[PDB]
Design a protein around this motif. Structure first.
Motif, mmCIF file in Angstrom:
data_model
loop_
_atom_site.group_PDB
_atom_site.id
_atom_site.type_symbol
_atom_site.label_atom_id
_atom_site.label_comp_id
_atom_site.label_asym_id
_atom_site.label_seq_id
_atom_site.Cartn_x
_atom_site.Cartn_y
_atom_site.Cartn_z
ATOM 1 N N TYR A 17 3.696 13.715 -5.692
ATOM 2 C CA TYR A 17 3.529 14.288 -7.018
ATOM 3 C C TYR A 17 4.258 13.481 -8.092
ATOM 4 N N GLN A 18 3.530 13.062 -9.115
ATOM 5 C CA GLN A 18 4.130 12.291 -10.208
ATOM 6 C C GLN A 18 4.888 13.358 -11.011
ATOM 7 N N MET A 19 6.166 13.196 -11.164
ATOM 8 C CA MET A 19 6.942 14.195 -11.930
ATOM 9 C C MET A 19 7.331 13.667 -13.306
ATOM 10 N N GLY A 20 7.383 12.360 -13.514
ATOM 11 C CA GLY A 20 7.746 11.737 -14.793
ATOM 12 C C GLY A 20 7.216 10.347 -15.050
ATOM 13 N N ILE A 21 7.415 9.773 -16.223
ATOM 14 C CA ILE A 21 6.933 8.422 -16.559
ATOM 15 C C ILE A 21 8.119 7.618 -17.017
ATOM 16 N N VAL A 22 8.308 6.353 -16.876
ATOM 17 C CA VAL A 22 9.598 5.760 -17.395
ATOM 18 C C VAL A 22 9.576 5.741 -18.924
ATOM 19 N N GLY A 59 0.862 -1.191 0.000
ATOM 20 C CA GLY A 59 0.000 0.000 0.000
ATOM 21 C C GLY A 59 0.904 1.249 0.000
ATOM 22 N N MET A 60 2.091 1.049 -0.485
ATOM 23 C CA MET A 60 3.113 2.099 -0.588
ATOM 24 C C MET A 60 2.947 3.000 -1.815
ATOM 25 N N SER A 61 2.532 2.460 -2.955
ATOM 26 C CA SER A 61 2.373 3.324 -4.155
ATOM 27 C C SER A 61 1.030 2.898 -4.753
ATOM 28 N N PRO A 62 -0.039 3.426 -4.161
ATOM 29 C CA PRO A 62 -1.414 3.130 -4.529
ATOM 30 C C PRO A 62 -1.793 3.616 -5.906
ATOM 31 N N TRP A 63 -1.054 4.496 -6.504
ATOM 32 C CA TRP A 63 -1.375 5.001 -7.844
ATOM 33 C C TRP A 63 -0.768 4.085 -8.910
ATOM 34 N N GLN A 64 0.075 3.139 -8.508
ATOM 35 C CA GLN A 64 0.698 2.232 -9.519
ATOM 36 C C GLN A 64 -0.364 1.356 -10.167
ATOM 37 N N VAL A 65 -0.263 1.201 -11.476
ATOM 38 C CA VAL A 65 -1.129 0.421 -12.368
ATOM 39 C C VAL A 65 -0.351 -0.568 -13.233
ATOM 40 N N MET A 66 -0.982 -1.695 -13.516
ATOM 41 C CA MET A 66 -0.429 -2.756 -14.380
ATOM 42 C C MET A 66 -1.152 -2.706 -15.755
ATOM 43 N N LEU A 67 -0.372 -2.394 -16.791
ATOM 44 C CA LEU A 67 -0.844 -2.383 -18.208
ATOM 45 C C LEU A 67 -0.623 -3.818 -18.674
ATOM 46 N N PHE A 68 -1.717 -4.527 -18.791
ATOM 47 C CA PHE A 68 -1.693 -5.963 -19.080
ATOM 48 C C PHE A 68 -2.433 -6.339 -20.378
ATOM 49 N N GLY A 100 6.191 3.567 -18.139
ATOM 50 C CA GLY A 100 4.822 3.951 -17.800
ATOM 51 C C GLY A 100 4.799 4.176 -16.310
ATOM 52 N N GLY A 101 5.513 3.390 -15.546
ATOM 53 C CA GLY A 101 5.510 3.601 -14.069
ATOM 54 C C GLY A 101 5.749 5.086 -13.772
ATOM 55 N N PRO A 102 5.275 5.550 -12.629
ATOM 56 C CA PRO A 102 5.427 6.936 -12.277
ATOM 57 C C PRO A 102 6.785 7.300 -11.686
ATOM 58 N N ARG A 135 11.137 8.637 -6.716
ATOM 59 C CA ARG A 135 11.018 7.182 -6.463
ATOM 60 C C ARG A 135 10.378 6.523 -7.674
ATOM 61 N N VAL A 136 11.098 5.548 -8.205
ATOM 62 C CA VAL A 136 10.655 4.764 -9.372
ATOM 63 C C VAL A 136 10.070 3.452 -8.856
ATOM 64 N N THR A 137 9.077 2.904 -9.527
ATOM 65 C CA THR A 137 8.337 1.692 -9.218
ATOM 66 C C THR A 137 7.975 0.867 -10.463
ATOM 67 N N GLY A 138 8.155 -0.457 -10.320
ATOM 68 C CA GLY A 138 7.849 -1.369 -11.430
ATOM 69 C C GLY A 138 7.914 -2.846 -11.015
#
Ligand SMILES: N=C(N)NCCC[C@H](NC(=O)[C@@H]1CCCN1C(=O)[C@H](N)Cc1ccccc1)C(=O)CCl
Lengths: 79, 30, 251
Positions: free
Chosen positions: C214-219, C10-19, C200-202, C137-140
């Protein structure tokens, strides 16, 4: 030359640097693509000449087609 | 939507720090 | 993500999986910016050279997941696309400029502890927070390694922002104003990078001033993954804000 990134050029350059001809600034689709963008009501989109309605650090460009990325730069000489 | 944006229910809202949060916060002040 | 860890839950609740629907296969990530819209790399949707091209139909979105694998039957939401908004001037033939894409989900999401939207940056945040030195912080769920390998769970890494010049000499590709590069200098003796599958990750940052994320970029792209002296590129989410709204309060 062509100064602030040809941000004010009323030439008739009407061809991508790959030698693809600009589709009509006012084309059916150059009007599709052009719809959620931020053209400067200062760069006057003349016929199908290369222009920079944008700010495009790169320079003047133009659509070359319909789908995204179907756009290209023109070859001027800037200062 | 978001207005209530970017506030984590299991953290900012429970008032918990995620285990690295801080390496980031100090990177601004430092 | 290369050289980071297991995201707390529950650390990066805005993360989404493009499947990709079938083959059921992972493509990239995305963010939740509100309750009907997600935000991703356009290249994740259309990139011809790879003869890659999806429609609101090839794809599915999974909001709320931990696991790269398991179907979280009661926490994650499998949602469907309504329409795709691929930046018109996306330059996929050159350097992937404006690697940005918007997807409108059919019916809205219900926020849980596991699902919450991030905040697009404003002029002042964007402004005070995007500087060489600060860390994001990057997430994937993508490649754990350049080569030789996938997280079983969310990976998080925090990398600092790098000066345009250093970015600009990092490589042969045209770096523009709609991209930034983050990562460790070689002499910095620390590492971490996003890698294939991350796109795509934030790239998010937390405000000192108000404490929101605040999302500042996309990978966006990068050469190698964790190569020395090579930095990774991220889309300037801000520099692309305008479009982001002309399309959302439009359609
Ligand atoms: N170290 C990184 N951060 N690497 C990139 C990972 C992200 C990845 N993006 C990519 O792979 C993009 C799309 C096509 C080629 N590519 C790349 O990053 C190419 N390897 C570099 C490139 C840049 C610009 C033009 C051409 C090629 C993705 O998931 C989408």
């Amino acid at each position: 030359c062509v100064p602030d990134r040809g941000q004010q050029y009323q030439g008739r350059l009407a061809v991508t640097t790959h030698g693809l001809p600009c589709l009509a600034w006012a084309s059916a689709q150059a009007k599709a693509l052009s719809k959620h963008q931020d053209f400067n009501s200062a760069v006057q989109l003349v016929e199908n000449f290369c222009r920079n309605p944008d700010g495009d650090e790169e320079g003047v460009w133009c659509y070359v087609a319909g789908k995204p990325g179907d756009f290209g730069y023109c070859d001027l000489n800037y200062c | 939507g978001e207005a209530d944006c970017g506030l984590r229910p299991l953290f900012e809202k429970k008032s918990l720090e995620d285990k690295t949060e801080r390496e980031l916060l100090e990177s601004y002040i430092d | 993500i290369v050289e980071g860890s297991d995201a707390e839950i529950g650390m990066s609740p805005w993360q989404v999986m493009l499947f990709r629907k079938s083959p059921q296969e992972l493509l990239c990530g995305a963010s939740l910016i509100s309750d009907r819209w997600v935000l991703t790399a356009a290249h994740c949707l259309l990139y011809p050279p790879w003869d890659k091209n999806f429609t609101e139909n090839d794809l599915l979105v999974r909001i709320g997941k931990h696991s790269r694998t398991r179907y979280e039957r009661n926490i994650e939401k499998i949602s469907m696309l309504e329409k795709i908004y691929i930046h018109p001037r996306y330059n996929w033939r050159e350097n992937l400029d404006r690697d940005i894409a918007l997807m409108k989900l059919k019916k809205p999401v219900a926020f849980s502890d596991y699902i919450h939207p991030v905040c697009l940056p404003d002029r002042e945040t964007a402004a005070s927070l995007l500087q060489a030195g600060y860390k994001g912080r990057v997430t994937g769920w993508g490649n754990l390694k350049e080569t030789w390998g996938q997280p079983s769970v969310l990976q998080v890494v925090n990398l600092p922002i790098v000066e345009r010049p250093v970015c600009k000499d990092s490589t042969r590709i045209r770096i523009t104003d709609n991209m930034f590069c983050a990562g460790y200098k070689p002499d910095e003796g620390k590492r971490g990078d996003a890698c294939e599958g991350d796109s795509g990750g934030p790239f998010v940052m937390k405000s000192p001033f108000n404490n929101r994320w605040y999302q500042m970029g996309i990978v966006s792209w990068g050469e190698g993954c964790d190569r020395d002296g090579k930095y990774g590129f991220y889309t300037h989410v801000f520099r692309l804000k305008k479009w982001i709204q002309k399309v959302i309060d439009q359609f």
